[PDB]
């Protein structure tokens, strides 16, 4: 499923003209400030839910579990601990 240079396995290409300029002719950091602020904000905003929802859910579960565990091993939690074991 992959060939090599000259016979890579692409369907025939026709009609595409590609253009580019030399690394010495270009400013490598052109538009960096716009990218760093606006591009990163867009990319991050669009993926935020997929991180926030699972992280926040599992952090909540952990927080509840660790707080209960802590309370069961106090004096106040003696009776509830006795039942739990």
């Amino acid at each position: 499923y992959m060939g090599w240079w000259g016979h890579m396995g692409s369907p025939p290409q026709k009609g595409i003209a590609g253009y580019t300029i030399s690394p010495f002719a270009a400013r490598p950091f052109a538009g960096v400030v716009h990218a760093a602020i606006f591009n990163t904000f867009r990319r991050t905003k669009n993926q935020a839910l997929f991180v926030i929802l699972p992280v926040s859910f599992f952090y909540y579960v952990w927080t509840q579990a660790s707080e209960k565990n802590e309370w069961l091993y106090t004096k106040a939690g003696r009776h509830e601990l006795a039942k739990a074991l």
């Binding site: 090599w4 240079w5 000259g6 692409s10 026709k14 580019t20 300029i21 030399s22 690394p23």
Partner: protein
């Protein structure tokens, strides 16, 4: 030793230049103009080429049909071509048909109708030319090469111009172009073959005396180009042959390195598998390419303009899995112009060029083209003795110094057309412009 080129001027500033050859019976007279597509802006790009079509579409006296007949009756032919910096209109005839041909050329240049009906008719013919150059692969490659090397500059524009302009070129802008550009101080009347100089000067006084002079007469071959390292890829898997051009910014006509760049070009040279002798050429690249079947052909070039040039190579190959090797070996031969060339290659190339520059001029049309080109680029015809001296002045140190400032580690303009999947990206090509071992 060839006969001396005689040169005279008129009062308007039209140059007349002639080289007589009493051994031939034909003569090529014509007008070389120091003007071409580069003189257009973006809005009238295509005008110079448009005019070339209309020049043969009828004058104030002779109609289109009469024009055809008059030339047919002369016996020879007329020809014209427009380039970026130069326009030519010439007539090849019999010895004694020269006064007729000068008269017809003077007519089509000064007194052309440019009738709205003819503008409208050619506007379709030229539109069809846009879709048929597509076949002339060398021209496609060189036009993309200029377009990218001189990105958004006048030298980068095509001669035909965009489709948009072809539809909007008016007789007004045609007339304006030829009034601004076709002035006497920019024109040379040239005769080669069976011409008398004194006869040609008289014909010039008769037909080209009412030519406008420009307000500010600069010398012939008077011009800032900013070369862009860049690439155009026109991949077409259905084509069997890849066409590749690689160039760097080269030298102008009046550069002090003009001969050095020609010698360097001759060290790499040309190659064509179809020619029998090509497998035995001395050039290292030729030997590599022929032994390994890397290419069908390659042609080194050193194109000059008034203020810049392009120096490089044009390759054709069916070996689509070894394009990488072809480009690699080519650029490693260029590296050697910087690192390795000695008196051995330099003196061999000088020998070959001393003859080559003279051999090229083998007919009246070639002679006229040589007088016309030299007069419109340098302001004078350079004698073969001067040319032999300038070639002899090229040393191996000159070639190395030139290559180290022009080739070594420099940006290239690269155009690939056809099955060029194997042509690597810009960086890997440009990395072959130097050698890490040196």
């Amino acid at each position: 030793v060839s006969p001396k080129t005689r040169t005279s001027n008129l009062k308007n500033g039209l140059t007349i230049a002639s080289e007589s050859n009493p051994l031939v019976q034909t003569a090529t007279v014509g007008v070389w103009i120091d003007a071409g597509s580069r003189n257009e802006n973006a809005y009238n790009n295509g005008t110079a080429h448009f005019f070339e079509h209309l020049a043969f579409k009828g004058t104030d006296k002779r109609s289109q049909h009469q024009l055809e007949l008059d030339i047919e009756n002369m016996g020879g032919h007329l020809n014209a071509y427009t380039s970026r910096e130069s326009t030519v209109y010439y007539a090849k005839s019999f010895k004694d048909d020269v006064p007729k041909s000068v008269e017809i050329l003077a007519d089509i240049l000064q007194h052309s109708k440019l009738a709205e009906s003819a503008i409208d008719r050619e506007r379709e013919v030229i539109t069809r030319e846009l879709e048929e150059v597509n076949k002339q692969y060398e021209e496609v490659v060189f036009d993309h090469l200029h377009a990218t090397a001189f990105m958004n500059q006048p030298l980068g524009r095509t001669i035909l111009g965009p489709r948009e302009n072809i539809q909007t070129i008016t007789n007004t802008e045609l007339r304006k172009f030829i009034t601004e550009n076709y002035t006497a101080d920019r024109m040379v009347l040239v005769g080669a073959g069976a011409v008398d100089h004194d006869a040609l000067v008289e014909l010039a006084e008769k037909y080209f005396s009412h030519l406008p002079s420009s307000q500010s007469p600069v010398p012939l071959g008077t011009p800032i180009p900013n070369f862009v390292g860049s690439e155009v890829r026109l991949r077409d898997d259905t084509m069997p042959v890849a066409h590749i051009a690689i160039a760097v910014e080269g030298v102008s006509w009046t550069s002090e390195d003009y001969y050095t760049a020609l010698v360097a070009q001759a060290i790499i040279g040309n190659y064509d598998r179809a020619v029998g002798t090509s497998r035995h050429q001395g050039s290292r690249l030729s030997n590599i390419v022929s032994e390994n079947n890397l290419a069908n052909s390659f042609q080194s070039f050193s194109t000059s303009y008034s203020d810049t040039g392009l120096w490089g190579i044009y390759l054709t190959s069916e070996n689509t899995t070894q394009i990488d090797d072809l480009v690699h070996f080519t650029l490693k031969e260029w590296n050697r112009l910087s690192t390795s060339v000695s008196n051995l290659q330099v003196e061999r190339a000088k020998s070959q060029l001393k003859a080559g520059l003279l051999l090229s001029l083998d007919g009246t049309t070639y002679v006229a083209e040589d007088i016309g080109r030299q007069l419109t680029t340098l302001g004078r015809r350079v004698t073969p003795a001067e040319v032999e001296a300038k070639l002899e002045a090229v040393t191996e140190h000159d070639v190395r110094a030139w290559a180290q400032k022009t080739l070594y580690d420099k940006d290239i303009a690269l155009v690939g057309l056809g099955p060029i999947e194997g042509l690597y990206d810009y960086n890997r090509i440009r990395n072959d412009m130097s050698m890490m071992r040196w």
